[PDB]
Amino acid sequence: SSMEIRVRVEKDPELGFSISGGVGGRGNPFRPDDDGIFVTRVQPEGPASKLLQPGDKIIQANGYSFINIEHGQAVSLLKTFQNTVELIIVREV
């Protein structure tokens, strides 16, 4: 059902998706009872278009856990990597 998937997104020039959630992020459109970070929109031309989909829950980025992370911390981390972000996501498959 749920699986942990690894994808690597190349910045071009950013990752090309949006996130909602996080501790203090006011929730997410998918699992309201989950504090986690969720992919919310994916740019169709962008570097994440073949890799991520709305609803994916990011649990790790370049080795950093996204479990029990604040919205702003999650955003800043993703933005501060210059070139590539290896993500572990949880997806309903």
């Binding site: 998706f17 996130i19 909602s20 992020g25 929109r41 919205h71 955003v75």
Partner: peptide, 6 residues
Amino acid sequence: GYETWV
């Protein structure tokens, strides 16, 4: 914010 682009 609710939704933030990265």
